[PDB]
């Protein structure tokens, strides 16, 4: 006689919609950071600055050509995973 298979479906493990990866480049180095979508970019900006051995105030960070304000979050700027932030010396 036939076997009686008794199954159950495993619901798919949900995808955390919480963090994204951002690539920060200054033309000489491109550094990736993983941050929460609702966290201010300030920390990212400082970590990049000190990694490059430069003062925060000596750099300006742009997203698609628009200057970023340290208090803004990836979410506020509609950033997506692997988007790019460019660091330029401040005029």
């Amino acid at each position: 006689d036939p076997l009686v298979p008794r199954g159950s479906e495993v619901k798919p493990e949900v995808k955390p919609e919480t963090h994204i990866n951002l690539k920060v480049s200054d033309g000489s180095s491109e550094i990736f950071f993983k941050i929460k979508k609702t966290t201010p970019l300030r920390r990212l900006m400082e970590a990049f600055a000190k990694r490059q051995g430069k003062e925060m105030d000596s750099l300006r960070f742009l997203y698609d050509g628009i200057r970023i304000q340290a208090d803004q979050t990836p979410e506020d700027l509609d950033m997506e995973d692997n988007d790019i932030i460019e660091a330029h010396r401040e005029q």
């Binding site: 033309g27 742009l62 698609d64 790019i84 460019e86 330029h88």
Partner: protein
């Protein structure tokens, strides 16, 4: 349409990897959505040239027939360069359907093509009479104007 589908792909690709110092993005409409057929971009002048320091703005307009037909690229009207019409239209070979345009050309190729043209005008496309005349017969004056223009956009 293949046009909007391709433009969505061009954006996904550009936002993840693009030449340093350049920027490009669709223009925002009244309701917050993007007009995929009209982009605003910026081309940085190359260091070591008279264009250095400036970031020259361009608009890229994709026709409904894109990618079969090339987009139209324009600097602001009055922009000074031998290959730039009075309207701002840039005369570039890869943007001419009868010359080197091909559907596979990417936004990156286009912007690098425009950047390369800045300091190396195409003698076979003199779209701005005074600019070409000076570039060719009055380099001293030509250089002076490019330097001033670089400050205007820096």
């Amino acid at each position: 349409s293949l046009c909007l589908q391709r433009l969505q792909e061009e954006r996904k690709k550009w936002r993840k990897d693009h030449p340093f110092g350049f920027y490009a993005k669709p223009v925002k409409k009244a309701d917050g959505s993007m007009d995929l057929q009209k982009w605003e971009a910026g081309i940085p002048g190359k260091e070591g040239t008279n264009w250095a320091g400036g970031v020259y703005p361009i608009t890229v307009e994709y026709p409904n027939e894109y990618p079969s037909k090339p987009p139209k690229v324009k600097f602001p009207a009055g922009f000074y360069h031998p290959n730039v019409y009075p309207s701002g239209t840039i005369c570039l070979s890869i943007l001419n359907e009868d010359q080197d345009w091909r559907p596979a050309i990417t936004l990156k190729q286009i912007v690098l093509g425009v950047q390369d043209l800045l300091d190396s005008p195409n003698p076979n496309s003199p779209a701005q009479e005074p600019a070409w005349r000076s570039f060719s017969r009055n380099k001293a004056e030509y250089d002076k104007k490019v330097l001033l223009q670089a400050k205007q956009y820096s």
